[PDB]
Amino acid sequence: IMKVANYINGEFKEPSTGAFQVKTSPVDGSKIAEVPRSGREDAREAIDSAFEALKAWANIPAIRRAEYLYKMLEVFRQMKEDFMKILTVEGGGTYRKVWGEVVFTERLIQNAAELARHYQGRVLQSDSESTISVVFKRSKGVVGVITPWNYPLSISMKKIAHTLAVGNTVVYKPASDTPVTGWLIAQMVAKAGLPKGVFNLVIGPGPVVGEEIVTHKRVAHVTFTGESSTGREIAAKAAGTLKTVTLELGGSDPLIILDDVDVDYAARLAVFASLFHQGQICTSAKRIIVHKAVADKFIERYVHYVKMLRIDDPRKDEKVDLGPLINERQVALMKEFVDDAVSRGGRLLIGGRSWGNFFEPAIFVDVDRNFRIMREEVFGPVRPIVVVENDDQAVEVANDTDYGLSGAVLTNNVNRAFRIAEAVESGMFHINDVTFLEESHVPFGGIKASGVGREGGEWSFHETTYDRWVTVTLRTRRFPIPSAL
Amino acid sequence: MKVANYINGEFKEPSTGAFQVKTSPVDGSKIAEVPRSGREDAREAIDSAFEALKAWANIPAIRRAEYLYKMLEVFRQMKEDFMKILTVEGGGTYRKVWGEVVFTERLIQNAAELARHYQGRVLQSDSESTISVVFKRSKGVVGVITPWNYPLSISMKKIAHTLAVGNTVVYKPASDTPVTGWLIAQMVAKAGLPKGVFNLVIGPGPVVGEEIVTHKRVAHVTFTGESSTGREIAAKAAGTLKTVTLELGGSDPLIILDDVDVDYAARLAVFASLFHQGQICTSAKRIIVHKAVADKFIERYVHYVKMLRIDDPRKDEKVDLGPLINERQVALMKEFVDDAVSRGGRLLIGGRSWGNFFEPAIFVDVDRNFRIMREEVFGPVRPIVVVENDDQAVEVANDTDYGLSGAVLTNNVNRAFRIAEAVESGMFHINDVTFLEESHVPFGGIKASGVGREGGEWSFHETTYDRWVTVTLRTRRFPIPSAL
Amino acid sequence: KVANYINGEFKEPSTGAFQVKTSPVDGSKIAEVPRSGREDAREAIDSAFEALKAWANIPAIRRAEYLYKMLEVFRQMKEDFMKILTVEGGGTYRKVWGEVVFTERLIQNAAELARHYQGRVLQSDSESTISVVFKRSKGVVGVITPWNYPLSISMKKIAHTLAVGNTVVYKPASDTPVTGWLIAQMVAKAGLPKGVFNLVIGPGPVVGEEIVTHKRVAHVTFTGESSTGREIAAKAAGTLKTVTLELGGSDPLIILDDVDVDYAARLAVFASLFHQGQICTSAKRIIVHKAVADKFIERYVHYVKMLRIDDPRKDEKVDLGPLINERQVALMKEFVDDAVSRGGRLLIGGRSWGNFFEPAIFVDVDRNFRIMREEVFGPVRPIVVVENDDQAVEVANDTDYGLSGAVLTNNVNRAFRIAEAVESGMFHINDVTFLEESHVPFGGIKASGVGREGGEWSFHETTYDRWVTVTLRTRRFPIPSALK
Amino acid sequence: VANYINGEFKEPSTGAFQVKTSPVDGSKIAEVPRSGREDAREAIDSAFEALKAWANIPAIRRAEYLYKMLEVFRQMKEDFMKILTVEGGGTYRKVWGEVVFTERLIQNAAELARHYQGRVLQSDSESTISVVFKRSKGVVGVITPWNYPLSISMKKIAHTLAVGNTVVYKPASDTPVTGWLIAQMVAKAGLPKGVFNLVIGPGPVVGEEIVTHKRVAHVTFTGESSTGREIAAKAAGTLKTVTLELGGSDPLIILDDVDVDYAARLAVFASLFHQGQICTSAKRIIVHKAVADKFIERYVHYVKMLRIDDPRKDEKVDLGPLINERQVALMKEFVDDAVSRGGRLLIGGRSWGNFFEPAIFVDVDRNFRIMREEVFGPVRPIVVVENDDQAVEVANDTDYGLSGAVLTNNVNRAFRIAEAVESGMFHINDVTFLEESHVPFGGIKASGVGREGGEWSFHETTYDRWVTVTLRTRRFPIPSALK
């Protein structure tokens, strides 16, 4: 009953050119909807709308913005089934995956609303007499939000909700493979009645709409989640106008398993961590590193549970374990990873088959550091297991990557857990849990090739505000020039 | 006098032996021979800093603080040497360089004081049986690239605070002030910091600086200089995804309302607009005065400008203004004066120049198309603009690409606060100079003036990252495989 | 049918004892309410104590969920709360509307903040040591409240204390029990776990004193008279329980000579006489600069004369309702008589009928007047004329109290100097003395009490810090010294 | 030895004095004042008069004074060490540790003075600026004990001064000379008259005056719980706030997966350093049955190795004497009670003069006095438990709640125990008496209220002050008739 459209300055509308393209399901290639194929003029219009809305939005008290976010939360709760349906048919997520995403998104919107009134500046001691010295927080301005296709709802809403809460306005460009999710977000914002221009949606190609957002002089900041190469490109283009950036660029997270673990539990945890959403998670456990003393048993248990994984049309029922990859390019790339691993002498323990956009888990042992699946982020269900002889070697292998997003160690020893946690080079780390733990208000982000900045709660606020030192001087004084006086 | 690099605990020549002669802006006399380092020297410094990093980051903060207190002790005995060099090399007056050295003492002390006290957070977890905390970790090897106007205080704010939280440093000072950089390295050497923790490489920005900015073992670059340079650094830094702190100058407004002590306002204005010959990022570069007091203000302001004593800054302690740093600065100031005259400006006083000296040139009858309204004027050429009301004052104040600091003079609390809120700047001062600065406050700008903040814990924020760590104390069941 | 609420159950007091609650408007019966005794208090306290571990141990987000539930139920009960605040407490429509709106914000604020109360990760001075600070709830908290703003003061204490994982035993003022019962209705409908919140309606020296002396009560938060607070503080020492005390004030409202005098008078009337002056942060001592004193006094008295005193049930435009009981009228009469007897000039008012007191305004008072020496919790107000800012501050500070204060002026220097010099826990420039927001630190100094309430400050009061370390290396110990 | 009041060393107004003797051999140490209420009152009035000037200078000026105090202290280290030993009974190693920690304490206070921040808040109203300033409380009473008289005093004094309070200081009666050396240091550091004051006299006279005087804003106290309750009650009269650290009966929990020999070594240090006269001494040792036999054997072995001697003799004396005869008498009561109740005395119990050999008991139950009371001396129970639940139940079966520790290599057991133990502080795999200059030190339950150390000391002796500026006019709801 409704066409998919851009949302610009309070109005749903076609791209100026009228150009469109067809979004199909990764599940079966069926048509989902025609969606805009916007261009630079559409991006410019959204940016100008956001810019004209900015002062009114930034200057209302925080409690009024919080109220809008609470309304958004109420609208979101009414739309939950709609979001789950689209996350499954457009993104290929299983019932359990998209249920988790929608529950987390509810917490994210609520978290941003909760915190809006409480973002504080500081009162300082002055080293001078008769001086009041304080620091205010101010919003950065128009913020470009550019997002990926794997968790398109929760990742988008983490960025959008928190950015809006502290008084920025938004121009949002969803991933091209998940446009309907972005349009549903715009439906939600529109129903919550936010002032026109405060939130804008532009559906179109990254190299056109995204680039316009990243280079426009009225955009103050870009928050971006996607590939490291795209991130470096955006960071470079952002420099033209000195806009700041938040970049979350994926990972090759280590899951380190020591010899004192419950091996069956370790395997269960490892399967979930390494293969949930077909391993298409930035904090997926992408490199599994196991102590030689439990390695044989761990590998057997891990393969045992992998064998049980059910791959199917994610619309069929609520207990499907894995759906398809997002498109044919991903399948082609996973095939390259498997073929490379086998050519280099790796032992394919299980899996390897694919059909349409579906790709089975493919598990390797006997790998070395020159394997593509050890050197690159593997955004799909191909996973190496590396056996190490001690903790020193576990750490060396864990750190032998350009990435540095998250990581985890399983052990019951407090000394080994803390030493390894300290030594692993990552922006996040989890003792006795999955690598992709995430809460709405914690600093989420990485180091090294995994990006810059942190998002979540007040950390999102830190990214999209600045400090403003203000003083008041209550006495007159003599000045050193002209000295003759 | 021969100057050297300081790399991995050793003072040494550039690997090519290449040197160049540095002269005083005061009279052109030879001051020193200094390195012309190349990319190999930069790489050696970076490798040394990288190799020193883990040992320096991992000792307790109290130990790093001890090194900084020792550096403070060494600095206190070198005060006179720093002042002399800031005058003869940088052209600063006694009062200017005295102020810089006093502030530098405070900066080193501030970094030492704070090192033990930079805290992370313990969080509430939304999950049962989960401990959730956030640690602070140092970024790694930090490039420090600095300007010539306040080469000591600006360098030491960056260096001292960056070291405090467990970063190592590769430092490349401005080409016009290499000797101040070498003296900094001397102080650090005497303080006995572990080899590689601090390194000095003297050489051309486009060679040494570019190596620092593009090298994959450098984690962060903190830069103070021109907006165009900063834009280039930010773009180059993207290749390795290193972060940056950029302070790129300003065109700060000084707003003077009609309820002020006009004589005091003029005295304040002269100091704020012309101290160190206006060569200050937060100089009061655009003076904006309310119609009702404009005539009297302008008369007083020119009166006090006329009293300024311009002279060899080495002569005595009461010289008001010294020379500009080089002939290019003189040439630029002449362009600003030429443009203002050509567009109908009235030159109330000044414009005379001889050698590197320049008598402050003050213009009225200016409009928004004047170069001295549109560009940063990093020298002693100043426009005075008259406005009819507070709305216009704000409009003119914000009519700039820059956004560093700003100030308003008024006794009215409502006008003061409304103007402070409306002016688009990273910092703002009510009833004081535009260039107020303390050791521990967030210093920095918005718009074309740059990104990030420096000073105390804000410097720490720039050169550390947050690290979320959890411990889960209970086992649970996972959603896949569902057949379980 | 009004009753206690203990361990998830509405019930009669154990003795079955009751008393009648009457309206201050006309003495009409409102409801029979419990007259509980110590055994009722002990049952409540034991219920809270047994509920504590389960409530403190759930994740913060679950407690926030319960408070958001409470907020939903409150929004349904708004009309009920306003009706009772008026007929039981004597508040006008505008007063009770304001209290209900603020209460909604208070419950929301507590819910908002629950998940975000953080501890700290520290630098250790020792090697191989992790050092952090957690926040822990104190335990069972006694909540004892007054009659003037019984809903908003109760809910500020109750909501924030529950948010961070304490359980609550609540005893409302004897003159406002139905409000306390409606709160219990709200909590019950929100479905909080049994024992987490308990209501005991009864005499302060019986029920209240049991709460304050019981070994399983960890904290008491109290708002009321300074004498009562001092007794509670003393009694609380027996078990080393901590206390938050808000004990009223005698706030100065300082009016300088540069104000809009008409506006100052309008502000002063609102600040000094809203809710018949029965506000801890009422402007109880008006201090005006001699240069505007005559016009101010004329305008102030003019607006006071315009105040409509009537049955607050009559309509929404009634300005002033009755005092809470006849004992308050008798006290205000003593204040008026003492002022008259001491030579004070009664400008207007001072009549009373039933529980309704007509605002009595005095000039030509001195420091020995009871209305200058004591908190006047009613509509009797002194105006003092002063010659300069020094005198204003001397008179402002000449009080045992120190809760809030305000200054009206357009001069930024005079505003800040006066704000700094006035000895109070809170201070407002160009606004009323009783400004209050849900998340700011509300509280006083001197005889006005100890501690702060509001958002995270409420959390600070009812939690404690817990330093935890992990040492990751073994070491040698100094005894026995003989040992290797 | 004299008082230090308003910048001047002087004897009490009465001229009264008393002779202090060494706990080591009873020899004379010094004549010290016996001050009265008038001396306390004079100190308080001096601190009150000095307060505005001290509170109002920039924090950097107060920091400079503390840095100067630090330099003076560094020159007086040997003096402090001698007096802590001969007046306090501390061994060389104990007093060396105290002096080192005191240096760090003074430096920590100086470091933080410029950095104590308030907050800028979001306002729920339009056109409103809303901020929170930090202000000093005023005149602060500092009342201290005899066991670590230097470090405990200086942690309180240095941090309290740093944020702009003035100080009236009353040291414990058994350690007045240490108190006088502190006044000496402060005098040489040149602090303004009245900012710091020393009054030496009996707690029930000088202390009570401090606690009840109307111009004293806050009292920070360390000592016995009974005294603390006394002070908290008297303080209520003038609504002054208090900080109280009132000792502990800390559990040291030792699980079955430990290096048992290491555990014993750690336990001996934790339980008996300074003769157990430490608020955070490991006073109740709780050990898992699977390692208990071996642990008890190793622990008694190391206890037997302890060298008890004149602490003045050399640097390797492990234990000195208890502070006085009353402490010895109390320790005998604890031993008597444990024997009467069926405890097995594995070693120790001998006493001569103020010296006492650590008495170690097994076979104890919860009704023993040494399990129910704080044992501020070298008598220690070892209790055996069957599992972690039982370890926790025993650890919490105390009125106190100061510190605590668990020894284990298991992360789950360490954390669950840490969470479950009811204490203000807790340490995994270390001694119970860990202490740093800037961490929140203090207890729950009977162990007291408040925290001290760095910014936590600042919180105790400052208050928040909410200030607003409203930038627009508005209509008010009364009189409602106004248009």
TrEMBL record, chain A:
<feature type="binding site">
    <location>
        <position position="330"/>
    </location>
    <ligand>
        <name>NADP(+) 2</name>
    </ligand>
</feature>
<feature type="binding site">
    <location>
        <position position="227"/>
    </location>
    <ligand>
        <name>NADP(+) 2</name>
    </ligand>
</feature>
<dbReference type="GO" id="GO:0016620">
    <property type="term" value="F:oxidoreductase activity, acting on the aldehyde or oxo group of donors, NAD or NADP as acceptor"/>
</dbReference>
<feature type="binding site">
    <location>
        <position position="230"/>
    </location>
    <ligand>
        <name>NADP(+) 1</name>
    </ligand>
</feature>
<feature type="binding site">
    <location>
        <position position="233"/>
    </location>
    <ligand>
        <name>NADP(+) 1</name>
    </ligand>
</feature>
<feature type="binding site">
    <location>
        <position position="149"/>
    </location>
    <ligand>
        <name>NADPH</name>
    </ligand>
</feature>
<feature type="binding site">
    <location>
        <position position="147"/>
    </location>
    <ligand>
        <name>NADP(+) 2</name>
    </ligand>
</feature>
<feature type="binding site">
    <location>
        <position position="147"/>
    </location>
    <ligand>
        <name>NADP(+) 1</name>
    </ligand>
</feature>
<dbReference type="InterPro" id="IPR016161">
    <property type="entry name" value="Ald_DH/histidinol_DH"/>
</dbReference>
<feature type="binding site">
    <location>
        <position position="149"/>
    </location>
    <ligand>
        <name>NADP(+) 2</name>
    </ligand>
</feature>
<feature type="binding site">
    <location>
        <position position="176"/>
    </location>
    <ligand>
        <name>NADP(+) 2</name>
    </ligand>
</feature>
<feature type="binding site">
    <location>
        <position position="227"/>
    </location>
    <ligand>
        <name>NADP(+) 1</name>
    </ligand>
</feature>
<feature type="binding site">
    <location>
        <position position="230"/>
    </location>
    <ligand>
        <name>NADP(+) 2</name>
    </ligand>
</feature>
<protein>
    <submittedName>
        <fullName>Aldehyde dehydrogenase</fullName>
    </submittedName>
</protein>
<feature type="binding site">
    <location>
        <position position="230"/>
    </location>
    <ligand>
        <name>NADPH</name>
    </ligand>
</feature>
Automatic annotation (TrEMBL), chain C:
<dbReference type="GO" id="GO:0000166">
    <property type="term" value="F:nucleotide binding"/>
</dbReference>
<feature type="binding site">
    <location>
        <position position="325"/>
    </location>
    <ligand>
        <name>NADP(+) 2</name>
    </ligand>
</feature>
<feature type="binding site">
    <location>
        <position position="171"/>
    </location>
    <ligand>
        <name>NADP(+) 1</name>
    </ligand>
</feature>
<feature type="binding site">
    <location>
        <position position="145"/>
    </location>
    <ligand>
        <name>NADPH</name>
    </ligand>
</feature>
<feature type="binding site">
    <location>
        <position position="228"/>
    </location>
    <ligand>
        <name>NADP(+) 2</name>
    </ligand>
</feature>
<feature type="binding site">
    <location>
        <position position="204"/>
    </location>
    <ligand>
        <name>NADP(+) 1</name>
    </ligand>
</feature>
<dbReference type="GO" id="GO:0016620">
    <property type="term" value="F:oxidoreductase activity, acting on the aldehyde or oxo group of donors, NAD or NADP as acceptor"/>
</dbReference>
<protein>
    <submittedName>
        <fullName>Aldehyde dehydrogenase</fullName>
    </submittedName>
</protein>
<feature type="binding site">
    <location>
        <position position="231"/>
    </location>
    <ligand>
        <name>NADPH</name>
    </ligand>
</feature>
<keyword id="KW-0547">Nucleotide-binding</keyword>
<feature type="binding site">
    <location>
        <position position="204"/>
    </location>
    <ligand>
        <name>NADP(+) 2</name>
    </ligand>
</feature>
<feature type="binding site">
    <location>
        <position position="171"/>
    </location>
    <ligand>
        <name>NADP(+) 2</name>
    </ligand>
</feature>
<keyword id="KW-0520">NAD</keyword>
<feature type="binding site">
    <location>
        <position position="174"/>
    </location>
    <ligand>
        <name>NADPH</name>
    </ligand>
</feature>
<feature type="binding site">
    <location>
        <position position="209"/>
    </location>
    <ligand>
        <name>NADPH</name>
    </ligand>
</feature>
TrEMBL record, chain D:
<feature type="binding site">
    <location>
        <position position="227"/>
    </location>
    <ligand>
        <name>NADP(+) 2</name>
    </ligand>
</feature>
<feature type="binding site">
    <location>
        <position position="203"/>
    </location>
    <ligand>
        <name>NADP(+) 2</name>
    </ligand>
</feature>
<feature type="binding site">
    <location>
        <position position="203"/>
    </location>
    <ligand>
        <name>NADPH</name>
    </ligand>
</feature>
<feature type="binding site">
    <location>
        <position position="327"/>
    </location>
    <ligand>
        <name>NADP(+) 2</name>
    </ligand>
</feature>
<feature type="domain" description="Aldehyde dehydrogenase">
    <location>
        <begin position="20"/>
        <end position="467"/>
    </location>
</feature>
<feature type="binding site">
    <location>
        <position position="146"/>
    </location>
    <ligand>
        <name>NADP(+) 1</name>
    </ligand>
</feature>
<feature type="binding site">
    <location>
        <position position="170"/>
    </location>
    <ligand>
        <name>NADP(+) 2</name>
    </ligand>
</feature>
<dbReference type="InterPro" id="IPR015590">
    <property type="entry name" value="Aldehyde_DH_dom"/>
</dbReference>
<feature type="binding site">
    <location>
        <position position="227"/>
    </location>
    <ligand>
        <name>NADP(+) 1</name>
    </ligand>
</feature>
<dbReference type="GO" id="GO:0000166">
    <property type="term" value="F:nucleotide binding"/>
</dbReference>
<feature type="binding site">
    <location>
        <position position="230"/>
    </location>
    <ligand>
        <name>NADP(+) 2</name>
    </ligand>
</feature>
<feature type="binding site">
    <location>
        <position position="230"/>
    </location>
    <ligand>
        <name>NADPH</name>
    </ligand>
</feature>
<feature type="binding site">
    <location>
        <position position="245"/>
    </location>
    <ligand>
        <name>NADP(+) 1</name>
    </ligand>
</feature>
<feature type="binding site">
    <location>
        <position position="227"/>
    </location>
    <ligand>
        <name>NADPH</name>
    </ligand>
</feature>
<dbReference type="InterPro" id="IPR016163">
    <property type="entry name" value="Ald_DH_C"/>
</dbReference>
